Amino acid sequence: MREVISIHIGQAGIQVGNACWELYCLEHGIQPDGQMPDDAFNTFFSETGAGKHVPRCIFLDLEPTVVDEVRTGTYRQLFHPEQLISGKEDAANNFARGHYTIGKEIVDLALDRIRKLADNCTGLQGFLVFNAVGGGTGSGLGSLLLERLSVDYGKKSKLGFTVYPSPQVSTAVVEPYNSVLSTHSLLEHTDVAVMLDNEAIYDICRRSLDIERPTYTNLNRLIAQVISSLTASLRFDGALNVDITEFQTNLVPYPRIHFMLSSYAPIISAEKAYHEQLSVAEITNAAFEPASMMVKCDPRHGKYMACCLMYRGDVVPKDVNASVATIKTKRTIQFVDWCPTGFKCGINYQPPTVVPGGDLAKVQRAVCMISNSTAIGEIFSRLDHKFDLMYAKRAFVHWYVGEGMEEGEFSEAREDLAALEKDFEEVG
Amino acid sequence: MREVISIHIGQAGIQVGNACWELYCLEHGIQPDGQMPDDAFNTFFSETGAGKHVPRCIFLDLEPTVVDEVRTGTYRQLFHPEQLISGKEDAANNFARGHYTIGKEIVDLALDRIRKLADNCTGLQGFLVFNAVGGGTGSGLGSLLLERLSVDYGKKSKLGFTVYPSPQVSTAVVEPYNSVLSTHSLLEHTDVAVMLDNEAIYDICRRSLDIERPTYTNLNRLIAQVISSLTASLRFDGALNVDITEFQTNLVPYPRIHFMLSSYAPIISAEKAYHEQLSVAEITNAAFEPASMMVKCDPRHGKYMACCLMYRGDVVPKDVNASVATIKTKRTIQFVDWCPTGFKCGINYQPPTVVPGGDLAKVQRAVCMISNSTAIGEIFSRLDHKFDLMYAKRAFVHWYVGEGMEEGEFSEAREDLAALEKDFEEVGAES
Amino acid sequence: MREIVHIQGGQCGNQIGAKFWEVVSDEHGIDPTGTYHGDSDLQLERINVYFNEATGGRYVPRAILMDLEPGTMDSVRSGPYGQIFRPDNFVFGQTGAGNNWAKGHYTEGAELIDSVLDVVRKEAESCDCLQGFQVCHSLGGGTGSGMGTLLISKIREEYPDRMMLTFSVVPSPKVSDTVVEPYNATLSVHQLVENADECMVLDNEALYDICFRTLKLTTPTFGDLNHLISAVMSGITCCLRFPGQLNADLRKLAVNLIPFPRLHFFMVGFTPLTSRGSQQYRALTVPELTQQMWDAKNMMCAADPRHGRYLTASALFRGRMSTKEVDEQMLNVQNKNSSYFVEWIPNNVKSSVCDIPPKGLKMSATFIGNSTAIQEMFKRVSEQFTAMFRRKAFLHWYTGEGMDEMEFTEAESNMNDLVSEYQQYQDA
Amino acid sequence: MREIVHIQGGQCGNQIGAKFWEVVSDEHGIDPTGTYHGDSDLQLERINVYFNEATGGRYVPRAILMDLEPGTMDSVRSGPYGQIFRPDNFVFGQTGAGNNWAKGHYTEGAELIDSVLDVVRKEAESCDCLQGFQVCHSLGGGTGSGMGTLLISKIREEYPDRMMLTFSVVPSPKVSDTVVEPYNATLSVHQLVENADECMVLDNEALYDICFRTLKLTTPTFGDLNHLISAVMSGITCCLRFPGQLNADLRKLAVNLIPFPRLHFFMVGFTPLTSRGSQQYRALTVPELTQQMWDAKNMMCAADPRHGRYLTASALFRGRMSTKEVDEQMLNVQNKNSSYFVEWIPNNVKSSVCDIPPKGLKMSATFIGNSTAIQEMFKRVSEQFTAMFRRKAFLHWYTGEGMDEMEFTEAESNMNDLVSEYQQYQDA
Amino acid sequence: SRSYPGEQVEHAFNSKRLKNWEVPAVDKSQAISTSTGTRFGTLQPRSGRTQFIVDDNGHLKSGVPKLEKSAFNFTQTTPVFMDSAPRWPKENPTWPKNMKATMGYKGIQSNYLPTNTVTLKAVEVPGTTERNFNF
Amino acid sequence: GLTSNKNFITANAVDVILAKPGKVPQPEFQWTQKPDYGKVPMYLKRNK
Ligand SMILES: Nc1nc2c(ncn2[C@@H]2O[C@H](COP(=O)(O)OP(=O)(O)OP(=O)(O)O)[C@@H](O)[C@H]2O)c(=O)[nH]1
Ligand SMILES: Nc1nc2c(ncn2[C@@H]2O[C@H](COP(=O)(O)OP(=O)(O)OP(=O)(O)O)[C@@H](O)[C@H]2O)c(=O)[nH]1
Ligand SMILES: Nc1nc2c(ncn2[C@@H]2O[C@H](COP(=O)(O)OP(=O)(O)O)[C@@H](O)[C@H]2O)c(=O)[nH]1
Ligand SMILES: Nc1nc2c(ncn2[C@@H]2O[C@H](COP(=O)(O)OP(=O)(O)O)[C@@H](O)[C@H]2O)c(=O)[nH]1
Ligand SMILES: [Mg+2]
Ligand SMILES: [Mg+2]
């Protein structure tokens, strides 16, 4: 009844889709063979007339080399085969091919799947978009897919958990280009867009979890922990139940500013749990810790326009109000004047779940923080520098203008960042 | 009392009649040897003095090479051999041969057999005509048969399921001529026509059944399913019974516009069935989906004028009503203004039957949607443009003029088709 | 029903008929004693298209062997399958034709035709519904060409409604077996334009390449080329003899191919043909067949399709195959090579199929194409004719038979008109 | 999906093509008989990138062997893995090429071309979705340089969308197999600039050093060098053939590499390479690989990158490894040795990885880098060319084939504008 | 087609409660002249003499003000609301594009049988026709 | 020598600036908008 639709685009979108959908199948006792040995699974599934629970997700991509693994992996009986969409060839780290050449003959094929995937929902909250900004399929198909959604749904809430090009660590040379073009395309079409970088989560894996051989399957396991902690109120009881509609309202001051930060606490090894107590005050303190941010942005250079908190486990409301009061007494944290408020809160009586073979520790308190800081103008600016740096010689452009783009879409997409940059200062 | 007569002309006619009758015998428990181990078979069969159920069909053709396969097959004890009608020589993909030269020798025996077949009938509902437009026999001989049937009965109702010449996939080169000729000939005589295309059904078999190499028999299985769904209400109980006259009246708005599309849902594989739920709302959405149309027409290039739906199995009228209301509220479905109404719905308690060694999956709900849209203007334009491109040079015309025709028949047919497409334009235009 | 009577005129005619009736006989499992010894009943259902039941269960062909110089008929009476023919269907003349079109058409022909026609009628009324005639020729000689055409122009009046086929072996400048070929060619062609419904033109050139390149044969003897010609003649009448999910009798193959009453010159090719070395690298699929049959190397005539534009084409597949795979291959061709097909014919290929492959294979195909490159066969001949007739060499061998000279201009003009018919419809 | 097709032009191309297919065939575990006798299902998953099914489960390569002097096509037919090619895909000529670019590109090329294009299309249609072509040249001789580029300048007009590589072996500055070698180079370079998307340059000299310094080999045979070239050609398509936590198709590797359509001259290096002595002292870690590949010794072309400035680079790793370690390593390189990298490209590396190493190893790597030191090569050949061309030495050989003198100046100046593009873009 | 207000049962007939979140088509209800102009208002009465504007076969008989090219929904004006899904006889990344066919030419033309391979020549003599086909 | 002495930087910039955007897939042509959709064609007159 409290239903959502989860979309995964590109390789990253699918590489996290394996993580999250391994979590939920575990969080509701769902065997990988569909069935299990109500109103709980109905948020992410569809109990057919006899036994089996089909997930209400859609894995969209162009390279066959990832979706076939899912078709041969253990989670192959799960997905309706028509949901897993895969093409012949990919966009090849090029925004045009994902936006003008290849994307245009598969969107409607995805829409027919999304169409029939929205009707079986009796109460819809909103779409969840997992994106990979910096590639061709994620940045190209994604932006093209959202506009087709905005004309088809318009008012519905579309969230974006868009992984973002890291400052130093980078596995691409053209990723400044297809990132800029992505934002100006999603800026007017996503309702709210969370950000997160692969490097910022690498250090989390270094300091806290103390894993020195980290891989992507060590990061995607950290993202599923966020959303499981974000959509607990949709499927689990607990005081201060909070849905998605009430999430964008008290968090997005202007129609432009919807780029936000994320955090999580605690994040500890299996053994230091036997060295700690994890009081609720300690958690929310470490939640505001810049070192616990999932983006390589520094909040201590800017001010907070809003905050959102999702607690979980053994938490009672007096201490949330007691400890938040303390953080508002601290001075390292600032708030822009025109929001004396700023703390939407949430509780859940279902502690986070642990995965066999995972790296987290069994705990009973946790916090997933989401904030809209004005310091997010710094990570924004570098993309405007490297774009402007390469665009002066117009290197690599003969590829974009070779696949159905012209010079307009470059300056067009470049000014909006300038317009958005001043917007991040007009609020000060 | 609820009895119909079936006519399978040309090759594809009997090719699909074989599937329809393997369906009906299995559905009613009739062994291939005529008899089984009332009012349920009487729609399609006739009981002799003891046990034998002979079908009330006719298989008409000009090539012995297929009627003899039928005569030698396992389905040889069924038919009165006088029903299986064959000729010494074929029409050779030539409308003139099928109409003027060859078919006029066996129309006499076809008509007297139809007379003897309709005599035993008490209450006759109508004539089903399974035809394949594009081949000389099919086209010309069906035109001749329909003219004779209209002058004989007139008051009876003729449905014609016409496998239509396809846009690109085509096993012929002259068929743009005989398609126009057959249309101009039968238009005044058929009471309703259901169009369906090999390309569209190929695409359906590809995308739904996961079969990649259908040898003209999967298409026939699908057509058999469609007719079984369409004629259920004649021989099976259920709320909202619907018969042939009710079917044609609220569906044919003008004397000219009587060609209509078709669809079916669900149509899936034995594993997607077992891994899906197929509620009635999903079924109706899939039926009204364009990618389920059995013809190569896109309904989003036009506006509906009426629709007919036949639900089968575990279906409830409130759910039917709610799904139709949802379809109406939807924005991608258009309707020509002068029909605020537009849906004739019927229900049957009998779920669709499955065949041994088949390819569909056992389901409990199914829908056969039949709509009359103003988008078949596009297929008429295609056919007319192809006829034009060819007849601009008088290509192949010597065959038609030698086999007993003249030139004026091409101009009459082309002007009739131009008028028909102008009709399909105007009657849809709104004030 | 649809009986067929078969003529074999000339040495070549009497020689390829020996293979044809050996190929078909094996296909219907009849010993050289005429007794049936097959396995299935599909050999008995339509046997009456070629044979006549006799006493004791003998099946005797509906053949007619006409030739001067009986020195060839003791060869067919010597071969393994030489005992099956009715000895009264053996019209031979004690004298010869000396490689002269005139005497094979005026002096000696006119002395056998009175008898030959009593043979052809004895087995034209033995049929309930006669389908048509078919002949085999060699346009170079005098017996095959002369008596060949003289026999034809007699059939065209006694049976104008029925259909006449012609497997003419056109001469070629590369294999100059004799000298007076061009005279014997045109004088025969002038008889084929008016008195023939279809005319497949085959050449010893392309009959040699397939043996040297495709079949990689070491010593291609005429006993091996006849194994190639006899293949297509059996590949034609499959739908007449055997069932098929899409049959195609002899007449509908004409109307679907010849738009204007003159262009009855076709071009053939059989598939599949492999070496004994490549049976190891080959797959038995339809796409393999549909590539070899369209390959311009297989065309049994030495006219290159890459210079003309296909008016129409055909394909007679055999074997229990899938019809969708053949309906789209013949479709994918025209879409790609759009220039090599005329535009005032939208879909210019006809496709047949039979469920009964040859006696040894599981899948086989046969091709017929009506291209505008067939003029090249007529350009070369009309050149050598006008080179010598301009000087009137060797002519006293034709006039001495009563012939006039005006028959040498009509026979050439009627060609040069036919050569231009094939160029109007070639828009380059 | 992602089908390739592989060309082998010339003696070298027909001799290193032997080794390439002896590496892949082992990688997918197919016996010299052709039949597959591997272990896992990972072989049969993406076999269709390089092979075609045949009866009885046998895979033949989609290679094309073109070369004059059939005296080499007996060697490949007699090599261990020679019985796997199709006998059709052997286009030879009984005439020699004479180490003359003219006749290889003007006379003897011109008649073999169509006989090769008839072949390439017979396996350009066999593909489901063609990825692109790839060639193995040798810019010294006449077969690889004359028929090589002439084949390219034909492939480019029938398949311009697709993507063609070039593993061109270039002439050597100190080693001179032949005397005319400078001419056959420049006149061939002038073809690669306009009809090649990517072109790696290999020289036998760096192949000799790596064979003497790293491998410490006593007798480097030609069959040993090609074990290096065939090692990197197989190292490109590891993402095409096997899963990987960061896969990279071939197309996305080019766009991230060439900023402008002309600077497609790359530089390769394979790792790890070690004697049978140092296999005792070496550790199989990622910092070992990235140290050896960035060295100025693995550069299989004899140009020193410390004289130029890397525009971009790449790395294709294989073996279950940590995806962070491979990112922080490549991150350090740009920061420590920050002078050899350009300024207007912020992040100028790309990093892929595949879960499947080579058959006999556990971890490997592969390097591609588009430097500006590559202009030292084109300087060397442009000194020897303008030396002997100034006096028309050995010129009567080229002009006898219909060539002229402008065909030299064009090809020379087209190397001068090219050698400055690499210079003006190299701002120290 | 229009949607006339079913007054007491007008609730539970919005698109939402019918599980349709796709920006409902409201013109089918707004073309009507209801009192409040919305789904819940009652409509208006008429005199009801009901003239004709059309002869027997459609084809608006007089100069009735009509919109041309309706009932067609042309491509140049089809908002992204309306859109088609391509079907099989058409290339697309989802279904496989099976193999195609081309014609491969005869070979290198000669005076003997055409061959694919080029051979040496004993008598070069520029511009002369001498071969040894027999080997 | 014939050195060009042109600024390849500016040349490539101008080429990228003034270039055709590329190839986009055209929409499937509609037959409802065929010019003769309503009326009888011309050549039929001369055929009569
Ligand atoms: N958190 C996380 N990020 C990933 C993962 N895999 C790749 N990324 C990052 O996603 C970005 C590119 O990923 P892709 O999905 O391949 O890009 P794309 O949209 O598919 O574009 P194409 O590769 O051209 O098809 C890079 O920045 C990666 O670092 C993963 O497994 N987890
Ligand atoms: N759905 C379906 N279509 C078929 C089948 N067989 C043939 N068709 C189509 O019917 C058309 C030809 O009709 P035919 O009946 O074979 O020709 P005809 O009417 O008998 O005329 P003649 O061949 O001259 O005797 C072709 O377009 C076929 O694609 C079948 O078994 N199923
Ligand atoms: N394919 C084929 N052609 C033949 C054969 N025998 C002769 N030909 C050709 O027949 C031509 C001469 O005609 P021929 O039949 O020998 O003398 P005719 O009796 O006057 O017609 C020559 O071009 C021969 O090459 C044969 O057995 N097979
Ligand atoms: N790596 C490698 N290089 C070779 C080999 N054989 C020849 N080369 C080089 O190829 C160059 C000449 O080209 P070649 O292929 O031999 O003659 P071509 O057919 O006319 O091109 C010479 O510089 C040889 O050194 C080989 O087997 N391996
Ligand atoms: Mg990607
Ligand atoms: Mg027929």
TrEMBL record, chain F:
<protein>
    <submittedName>
        <fullName>Uncharacterized protein</fullName>
    </submittedName>
</protein>
